[PDB]
Design a protein around this ligand. Structure first.
Ligand SMILES: Nc1ncnc2c1ncn2[C@@H]1O[C@H](COP(=O)(O)O)[C@@H](O)[C@H]1O
Length: 449
């Protein structure tokens, strides 16, 4: 369990935010009903507002989402309503949000050699969420300077905050003559994609220093493409920002680094196709689940294979879909993870051995089990709790099937069962945790060679 991971430097971009979370109870929803009126809410629920313009909009959309138990996200109509919303519906706790912020703080906890995180906005309240060991790129006096986020914040900068409302399964309240029971625990999110506050991009002053960043770094993890809009009020489009994102990878890759992408669940099929066209063909590693790999194969035209994966979920079909992704997009490794297993596929000429790829995946299952059972990771010593979680029994059966499948190839295929937690404290961002552990451990073993 010796960690060669600490010898790795990494760059992260682009999405960082603050998560203000409210843990709802029956008493909280009852107070909203009395304050705003049972009859006005019912009338508003039939209206089904697309955006929240008055406090009654948030109340109606929240109750509507609890009734279905399905996730829902509704933005505020205007950014000038932020202070009014926060003073009206107070939070329980604030913490770091976003794929960059969460993973960077975790990598800083794991004593990585150098962790450079970048985000467009850096207010004082946001810069205090970062770990003190993190570094933020700044241009001053015509040179690239890495300084700590608390020493590089800006007072005039806006802040991006996601207001999250969690409700447990079976929360019961009465609205009118209807009795409402939550069929499933879920989250209702009040958040906005960046426009007129910031943009998903590396600013023009830092773009000339991306190759210099790629020299002092071993690998990069890029995320946040789901926040790009189709059109913008100033006249810019998604193509404008996806082209520049393609430029950032090319500038970073003028030096020898590995770039990793975690395939996020993007509802917009048009932005999802942009990530397949602009980002995926230009990175070196990709991680996803069974649902997203079927979405990718569907975009590539393998509709017959996409339907088999979503309907039956047999490992032999998922393996065949990952081999299509590997050969088409100049990738080095494809990683597929579920609740039962995590699959790893590389080409035959990969410098790592079969047993080394297993050790890479064994670290990913320990880091994931720790976060699922503990709910959060605050110290390196906490990994011993994830070690206590035994392997999935059904995944051991899948492992034997993969060994037998190799009866007659140019691929290194490794399967390992996942350390499943029966009663996890949380499940948000667990896919980013497994994928980061596998990629970071994979870059470690390549560095030894
Ligand atoms: N109770 C659990 N114990 C361990 N791992 C889990 C548990 N629930 C979910 N996971 C992992 O979380 C991943 C979710 O990633 P995603 O759906 O891509 O965000 C799954 O593929 C599982 O590997």
């Amino acid at each position: 369990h010796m960690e060669d991971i600490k010898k790795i430097s990494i760059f992260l971009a682009y999405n960082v935010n603050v998560d203000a979370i409210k843990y709802l109870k029956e008493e909280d929803i009852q107070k909203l009903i009395e304050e705003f009126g049972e009859e006005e809410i019912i009338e508003k629920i039939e209206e089904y507002p697309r955006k929240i313009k008055e406090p009654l909009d948030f109340v109606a959309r929240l109750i509507h989402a609890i009734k279905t138990g399905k996730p829902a996200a509704v933005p505020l109509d205007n950014e000038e309503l932020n202070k009014w919303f926060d003073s009206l519906f107070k939070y329980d706790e604030e913490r770091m949000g976003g794929q960059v912020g969460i993973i960077a703080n975790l990598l800083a906890i794991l004593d990585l050699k150098k962790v450079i995180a970048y985000s467009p906005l850096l207010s004082k309240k946001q810069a205090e969420m970062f770990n003190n060991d993190l570094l933020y790129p700044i241009v001053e006096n015509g040179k690239l300077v890495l300084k700590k986020p608390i020493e590089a914040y800006k007072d005039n900068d806006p802040i991006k905050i996601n207001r999250i409302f969690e409700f447990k399964e079976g929360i019961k309240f009465k609205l009118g003559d209807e009795k409402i029971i939550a069929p499933q625990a879920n989250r209702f999110i009040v958040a906005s994609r960046p426009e007129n506050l910031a943009r998903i991009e590396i600013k023009e002053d830092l773009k000339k220093y991306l190759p210099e960043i790629g020299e002092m770094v071993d690998c990069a993890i890029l995320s946040g493409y789901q926040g790009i809009k189709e059109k913008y009020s100033d006249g810019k489009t998604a193509e404008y920002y996806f082209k520049r994102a393609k430029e950032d990878i090319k500038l970073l890759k003028k030096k020898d680094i590995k770039v990793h992408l975690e395939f996020a669940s993007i509802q917009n099929i048009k932005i999802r196709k942009k990530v397949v066209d602009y980002i995926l063909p230009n990175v070196d590693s990709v991680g996803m689940d069974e649902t997203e790999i079927a979405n990718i194969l569907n975009i590539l035209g393998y509709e017959e294979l996409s339907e088999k994966i979503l309907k039956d979920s047999k490992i032999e079909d998922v393996i065949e879909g990952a081999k299509i992704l590997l050969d088409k997009f100049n990738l080095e490794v494809v990683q597929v993870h579920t609740i039962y297993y995590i699959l790893f596929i590389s080409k035959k000429d990969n410098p790592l051995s079969k047993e080394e790829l297993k050790k890479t995946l064994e670290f990913a299952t320990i880091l994931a089990a720790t976060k699922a059972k503990l709910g959060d990771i605050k110290n390196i010593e906490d990994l011993k709790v994830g070690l206590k979680v035994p392997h999935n029994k059904y995944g051991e059966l899948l492992k034997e099937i993969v060994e037998k499948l190799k009866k007659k190839e140019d691929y290194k295929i490794v399967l390992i069962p996942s350390r499943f937690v029966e009663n996890p404290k949380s499940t948000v961002g667990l896919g980013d945790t497994i994928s980061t552990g596998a990629f970071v451990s994979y870059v470690s073993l390549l560095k030894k060679k």
